Amino acid sequence: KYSTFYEQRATLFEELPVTSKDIIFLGNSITNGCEWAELFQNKNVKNRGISGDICMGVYDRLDPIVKGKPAKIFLLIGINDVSRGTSADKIISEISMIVRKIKQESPKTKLYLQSVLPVNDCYGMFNGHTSRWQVVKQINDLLEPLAVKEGVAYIDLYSHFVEKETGKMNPVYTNDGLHLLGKGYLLWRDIVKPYVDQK
Amino acid sequence: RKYSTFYEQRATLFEELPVTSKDIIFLGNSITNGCEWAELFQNKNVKNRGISGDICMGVYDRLDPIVKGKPAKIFLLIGINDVSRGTSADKIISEISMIVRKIKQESPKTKLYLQSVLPVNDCYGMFNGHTSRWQVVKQINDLLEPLAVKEGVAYIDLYSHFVEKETGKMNPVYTNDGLHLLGKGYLLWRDIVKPYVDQK
Ligand SMILES: [Mg+2]
Ligand SMILES: [Mg+2]
């Protein structure tokens, strides 16, 4: 069904309680990679990232997050569905399933849909991901209208990470064309801190 | 290449995250990286300095952004990826000794805890370079506890709680691959190490 690493993380998350004060970062490797409470100097921020995760993988593990009725969920997902050849509209339909379930199970949770980050094939790594760099904007052009339809926030990380001239991630933020260096996380911190702190 | 790029991702992140005199650092490889330590201990002072794929000299090489903050405690778990490279228990211990002496020199007030290398199990046919070397885990631990005594630091026997009967292999209840931990595995680690974390 899913990877052994997914099972390790998911079974750990089943043992860690979520409370009404928690601010959850939910996603794939790009979420897994950070120390979120340290980045925000906020003990209420928690990591629910799993390297390799896909939209259906996130859907399938919502229960141990939404049952705690967290204050906030920041979602960043879809780039591993891109590497499977799934079209943008199909990915957005799956993200709609996630948003609908969070709203139904925990209506007081503030949900923030984060733009899929750009990617770059310059490093010749993750070719399934980085060769489909044009799908990122395709997703984001449909994700912003989804947010507006469902009454949830859309956060444009993408415009801060992209190079205008290429449509690809600025190499200053990555060593592989997909994941973030520390500088990358500091930029994400600067963009989303006002939303993390908002009442 | 994926381990080398992931190391630089995590290391460069840790260079941007300040360490303070209250902090309790979990330092190691994937088995440290895989936890949410502050959630496990319900303790905002506990921080993750784990990097999947890391080896003893990769931990040595990135001590500066941890020891400069003079943390209260460092819990070290390292070595199994050196085992998987065919490196001898003796050479592994020599590199752990380098880590211990550098921590003591740079941050003498830091309490250092050397955690037994965890057992492994070849029953899932995964990570063969690791799991087929299950006998090297006790070879290291039999030298690691004397090293802890010689350097005046704590040795933490996790291994005896995780190992099955007298097979010298990890109990499959704690793992789905013979190397890494399920949530149940981190709860056992929590139960063993919480009294050390809680030390005044
Ligand atoms: Mg770069
Ligand atoms: Mg098992």
Author numbering:
A (entry chain DDD): 24 to 222
B (entry chain AAA): 23 to 222
Text from the published report:
Structural characterization revealed PvSAE to be a dimer with an SGNH fold, named after the conserved sequence motif of this family, and a Ser–His–Asp catalytic triad. Therefore, bacteria employ esterases to make acetylated sialic acid more accessible for cleavage by sialidases.
A crystal from the Apo I condition diffracted to a resolution of 1.44 Å and had P1211 symmetry, while a crystal from the Apo II condition diffracted to 2.06 Å resolution and had P61 symmetry. The result of this change in conformation is that one active site is more accessible and has an ‘open’ conformation, while the other is still ‘blocked’ by the N-terminal α-helix. We suspect that this conformational change may be important for the accommodation of large, complex glycans that contain acetylated sialic acid. The high resolution of the Apo I structure allowed the identification of a malonate molecule in the active site of PvSAE. As the most N-terminal α-helix of the Apo I structure has different conformations, the two active sites accommodate the modelled 9-O-acetylsialic acid in a different conformation. In the ‘open’ active site, the 9-O-acetylsialic acid is positioned such that the 2-position projects towards the bulk solvent, indicating that this site could accommodate larger glycans.
